[PDB]
Amino acid sequence: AFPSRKDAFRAQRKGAKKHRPEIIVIDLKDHVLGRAAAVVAKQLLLGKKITVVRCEQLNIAGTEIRNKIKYLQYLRKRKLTNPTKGPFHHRAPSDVFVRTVRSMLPRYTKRGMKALNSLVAYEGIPPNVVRTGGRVVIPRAQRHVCYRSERPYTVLGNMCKHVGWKYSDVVANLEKARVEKASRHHEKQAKLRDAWKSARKEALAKMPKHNVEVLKKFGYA
Amino acid sequence: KSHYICAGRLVRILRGPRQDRVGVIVDIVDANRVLVENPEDAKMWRHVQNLKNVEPLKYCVSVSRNCSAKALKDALASSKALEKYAKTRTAARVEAKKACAVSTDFERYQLRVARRSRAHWARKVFDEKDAKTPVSWHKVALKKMLKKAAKMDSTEGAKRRMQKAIAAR
Amino acid sequence: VKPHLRHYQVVGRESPSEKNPEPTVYKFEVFAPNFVVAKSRFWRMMRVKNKVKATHGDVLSCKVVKDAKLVARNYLVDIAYYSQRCGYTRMVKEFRDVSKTGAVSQAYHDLASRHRARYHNIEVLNVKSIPDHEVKHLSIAQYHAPNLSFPLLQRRTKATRKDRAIFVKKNTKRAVVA
Amino acid sequence: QTKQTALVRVENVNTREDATWYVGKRVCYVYHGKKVKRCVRWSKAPARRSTTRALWGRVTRPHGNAGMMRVKFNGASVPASAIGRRIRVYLYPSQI
Amino acid sequence: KVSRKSPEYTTLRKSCAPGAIAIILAGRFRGRRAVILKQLPHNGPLVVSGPMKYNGVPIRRIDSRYVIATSTTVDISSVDTAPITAEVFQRPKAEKPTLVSDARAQLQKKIDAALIAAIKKDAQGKEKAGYLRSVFTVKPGDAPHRWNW
RNA sequence: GGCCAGAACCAGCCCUACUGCAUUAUCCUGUCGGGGAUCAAAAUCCGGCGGGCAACGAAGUGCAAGAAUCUUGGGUCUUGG
RNA sequence: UAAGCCCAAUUAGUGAUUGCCCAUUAUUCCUUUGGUAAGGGCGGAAACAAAUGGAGAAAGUGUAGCCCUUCCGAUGUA
RNA sequence: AUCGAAUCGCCACCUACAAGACUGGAGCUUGCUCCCUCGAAGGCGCCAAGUAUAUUCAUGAUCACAAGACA
Numbered sequence A: 001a002f003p004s005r006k007d008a009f010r011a012q013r014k015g016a017k018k019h020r021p022e023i024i025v026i027d028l029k030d031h032v033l034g035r036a037a038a039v040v041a042k043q044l045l046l047g048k049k050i051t052v053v054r055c056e057q058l059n060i061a062g063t064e065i066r067n068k069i070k071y072l073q074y075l076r077k078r079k080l081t082n083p084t085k086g087p088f089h090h091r092a093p094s095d096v097f098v099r100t101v102r103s104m105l106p107r108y109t110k111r112g113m114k115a116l117n118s119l120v121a122y123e124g125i126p127p128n129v130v131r132t133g134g135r136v137v138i139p140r141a142q143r144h145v146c147y148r149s150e151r152p153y154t155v156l157g158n159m160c161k162h163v164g165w166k167y168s169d170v171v172a173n174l175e176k177a178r179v180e181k182a183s184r185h186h187e188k189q190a191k192l193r194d195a196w197k198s199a200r201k202e203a204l205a206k207m208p209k210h211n212v213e214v215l216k217k218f219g220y221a
Numbered sequence B: 001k002s003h004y005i006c007a008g009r010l011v012r013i014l015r016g017p018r019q020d021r022v023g024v025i026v027d028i029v030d031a032n033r034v035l036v037e038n039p040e041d042a043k044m045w046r047h048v049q050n051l052k053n054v055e056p057l058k059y060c061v062s063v064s065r066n067c068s069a070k071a072l073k074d075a076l077a078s079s080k081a082l083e084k085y086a087k088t089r090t091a092a093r094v095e096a097k098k099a100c101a102v103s104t105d106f107e108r109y110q111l112r113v114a115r116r117s118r119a120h121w122a123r124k125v126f127d128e129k130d131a132k133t134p135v136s137w138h139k140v141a142l143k144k145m146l147k148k149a150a151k152m153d154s155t156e157g158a159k160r161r162m163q164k165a166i167a168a169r
Numbered sequence C: 001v002k003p004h005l006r007h008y009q010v011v012g013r014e015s016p017s018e019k020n021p022e023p024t025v026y027k028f029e030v031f032a033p034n035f036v037v038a039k040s041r042f043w044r045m046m047r048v049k050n051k052v053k054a055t056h057g058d059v060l061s062c063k064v065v066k067d068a069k070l071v072a073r074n075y076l077v078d079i080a081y082y083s084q085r086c087g088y089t090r091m092v093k094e095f096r097d098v099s100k101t102g103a104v105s106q107a108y109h110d111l112a113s114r115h116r117a118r119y120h121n122i123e124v125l126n127v128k129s130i131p132d133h134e135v136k137h138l139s140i141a142q143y144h145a146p147n148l149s150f151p152l153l154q155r156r157t158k159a160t161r162k163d164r165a166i167f168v169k170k171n172t173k174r175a176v177v178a
Numbered sequence D: 001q002t003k004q005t006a007l008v009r010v011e012n013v014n015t016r017e018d019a020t021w022y023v024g025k026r027v028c029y030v031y032h033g034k035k036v037k038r039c040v041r042w043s044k045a046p047a048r049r050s051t052t053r054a055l056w057g058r059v060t061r062p063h064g065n066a067g068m069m070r071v072k073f074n075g076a077s078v079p080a081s082a083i084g085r086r087i088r089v090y091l092y093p094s095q096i
Numbered sequence E: 001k002v003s004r005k006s007p008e009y010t011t012l013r014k015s016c017a018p019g020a021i022a023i024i025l026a027g028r029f030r031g032r033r034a035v036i037l038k039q040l041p042h043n044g045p046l047v048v049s050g051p052m053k054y055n056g057v058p059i060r061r062i063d064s065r066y067v068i069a070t071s072t073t074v075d076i077s078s079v080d081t082a083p084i085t086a087e088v089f090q091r092p093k094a095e096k097p098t099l100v101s102d103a104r105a106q107l108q109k110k111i112d113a114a115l116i117a118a119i120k121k122d123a124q125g126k127e128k129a130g131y132l133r134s135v136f137t138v139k140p141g142d143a144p145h146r147w148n149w
Numbered sequence F: 001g002g003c004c005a006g007a008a009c010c011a012g013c014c015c016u017a018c019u020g021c022a023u024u025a026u027c028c029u030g031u032c033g034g035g036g037a038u039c040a041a042a043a044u045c046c047g048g049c050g051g052g053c054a055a056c057g058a059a060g061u062g063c064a065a066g067a068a069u070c071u072u073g074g075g076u077c078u079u080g081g
Numbered sequence G: 001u002a003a004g005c006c007c008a009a010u011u012a013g014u015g016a017u018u019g020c021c022c023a024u025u026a027u028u029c030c031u032u033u034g035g036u037a038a039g040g041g042c043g044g045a046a047a048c049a050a051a052u053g054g055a056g057a058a059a060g061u062g063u064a065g066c067c068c069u070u071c072c073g074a075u076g077u078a
Numbered sequence H: 001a002u003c004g005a006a007u008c009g010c011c012a013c014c015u016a017c018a019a020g021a022c023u024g025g026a027g028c029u030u031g032c033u034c035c036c037u038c039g040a041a042g043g044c045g046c047c048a049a050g051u052a053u054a055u056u057c058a059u060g061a062u063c064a065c066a067a068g069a070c071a
């Protein structure tokens, strides 16, 4: 986590710049829990570093009452002789997603532990993830293509709130301020975005005519 | 929009060997199939299409169910649906996608210098506008600092240090 | 998709002998995946109806009957199936299809899903194309409307197999993993 | 498992017809050791001397319908520590 | 009908014809585009000299398996290509063990002068001159298996 | 050099490309009569009559023997040179 | 909008009849071993020093098996 | 400071949001018609700072980790 002084000094000695690995950030809002977990688990075994955000907005098919009961049946499984060192029942929606992915990995191998350690899960979109780059989706695991809309579904955050997750209102307030801040910055920079769109229009009159013909042939003008 | 599946509706084939081709619904079998045909395409004789493989368009010719081939040919020509469709932006995108698929290494290069020439002149146009009214980060930052720095450099002590260390250069 | 059953006309008789110098020639209509199953069904009818075995008879022709041109039609299928609980249950069902083979193939998938009936427990009695005014079921007669239209809703449009991706940017079409 | 043949998933190769284009192409796994050892052009190109090493192979056939390939490495088998790591698929030997 | 023993024998593909502009796939000048001049005798390696003033590729012999011969070509009939023999690239043997010899410097100069004139005489000569100055790279999202060259 | 690697060719194998013969009629057409539903039709449908090839990228029907030489397919680190 | 149940396909009303993955199985290739094994050769053809083409050739159950070609089988407790 | 390494797409235009029984806008006739920016592209980047009048590339000798990498 926090870098050692040896690591920081070697960076000074090496003179290298800031480094960030190739990390995929997935917006898990309106994603099927087990379909997204199966897709992510295969990618982790393929050497991918993956961050998943908005784990509180994952979906499970069925009513919220039946999915709450399915967790309460999971919660009732514990080592009677010693409940410590028994199964650990995590309530956070990101912890539910990580446990689901872990069960789709060979967790008892050094290779399956490497894959699991490449996954970072969050509720909402934390500040260190907001500006890192464009978030992605899994089209084959999205709710609007996976469920018939007549059937009820549950949001993972609402189900988790009633089984022992205490930070539902904290994430709700933090997410409210995130969109409020992001929409203020998106209302700004509209002049910059419109100025670039009009420059690409004005460029078409300045650039060579035969290059505009090539642009039209391939559908870029 | 969502255009209704009706007799006379123009559709585009989504996938399969007839992908990106255009036909007319002509007849509806059930909830899953239709009888598409297009007289002006050689590969689009009357055939059964699954309704998952079609994309309804905004054009609808005036035909009845199970119309003759001659009736559809006259309706398609008079309605000018194919001429109107070819002028749309999504029709030009399908043609451009076909041009990119068969493009050689030379045409891939020619497109690359065309998009670089357009990008170069967009940068030149943006620089002209940016100088006039600041909209980029560095020009907005400069306009916020120009007033404060003028106040700080208007002093005699600032003016003297500037003169002394400019003459040293 | 094209139908999985084919229209067969098997023609055969019992082999001529001293008792039957000129045997009767029988024409049989069957919808089967191939002509080996078609001949098997022909000799099943000959045995249980005419008391003629495949080993004591010969087949005159086992050709496929050509489909008519594809037109949206109403097909009346007279069909029967066997179950241990109820015995033989004969029903008449209407289907919307473009061919006789397609309607019968649809009727076989229908009897499988709704009544758990397999091919060898099913006997087709008659299939024919009927006019719109002889259709009894409202589910079939709703496609006779002169101006029948409907929007395509709740549709899962998968991408072309070449252009399908794993991870795609949220509000763009750009593929991150593909 | 049969370690003599490896499975390689290439980017933007997602069909079996896509993986047939790569049959016979050269495949390389680049890693590093602990000590600097002998390389190609140890004397002709001393700048190449490094702890970096490569293991070479060739694509033999596709695997499944979804753009996978089978790769056979020269003589030996690729180490299991290469699993989940980067593999280089080159454009030679060229058929174009 | 050409015997395998004869110097005129060849099994080279028709795409790697003289005048074809080729992408170099391996070696020091990988990614550069060069012009195929000839094939050395006895089914020998191709000789490519993309105009060395355009991309820096000198008169070099390359194997046909390490080149992508594109469908865009240049008329080479004016270029002599006769003095490029297999003896040009032979080196003396070493006993008890940039610099370019006069013969190699003059051969490169004469061939490339006639090559540049050939490119100019062609329609799209300016576009093909800048085509040879471009560098081929495999980018993220590229699918060379689906491409036509 | 009895070491490593790349390309050439040989022979043998192993894969793909390239297809002809028969068949169709419960079919294809046009026209009369009925019947159908429309605002009016047309069509789905049933009969008589006249012609017939739904036509070879027609048919998902039976069998296919097409010298990868013409007309430079691919692999062999699965063989030996 | 199953990754459930019944039915049905193989890139899909397009133009024909092999989607893919796993064996100590099948086909084929290399090698070993044993046969109720099947055959050939074995009367040194002739010629040929070193300094600068070679070596071997046993009438044989079994060996480093006399040599070469060919076909088939090969697991197993007491 | 050992230390030679594996990694090979940048951005201060994606890096805001929501919806798929629909989110370009109207009309009434409610599935058709009409208008527009015509409803299938995040911008760059792939060797002249830009499409032109150009310029050093070798002998690193035919593949070999790209012999180099702050875009």
Ligand SMILES: [K+]
Pocket (backbone or CB within 6 Å): none
């Ligand atoms: K033996």
Ligand SMILES: [Mg+2]
Pocket (backbone or CB within 6 Å): A079, A080, A081, A082
């Ligand atoms: Mg216990």
Ligand SMILES: [Mg+2]
Pocket (backbone or CB within 6 Å): B045, F058
């Ligand atoms: Mg046809």
Ligand SMILES: [Mg+2]
Pocket (backbone or CB within 6 Å): none
């Ligand atoms: Mg034994």
Ligand SMILES: [Mg+2]
Pocket (backbone or CB within 6 Å): D052, H065
């Ligand atoms: Mg290196």
Ligand code: NA
Pocket (backbone or CB within 6 Å): A090, A095, A096, A098, A099
């Ligand atoms: Na957990």
Ligand code: NA
Pocket (backbone or CB within 6 Å): A103, A104, A105
């Ligand atoms: Na598991």
Ligand code: NA
Pocket (backbone or CB within 6 Å): B031, B032, B051, C152, C153
């Ligand atoms: Na529907």
Ligand code: NA
Pocket (backbone or CB within 6 Å): C153, C154
């Ligand atoms: Na629906």
Ligand code: NA
Pocket (backbone or CB within 6 Å): G060
């Ligand atoms: Na003996």
Ligand code: NA
Pocket (backbone or CB within 6 Å): none
């Ligand atoms: Na043997």
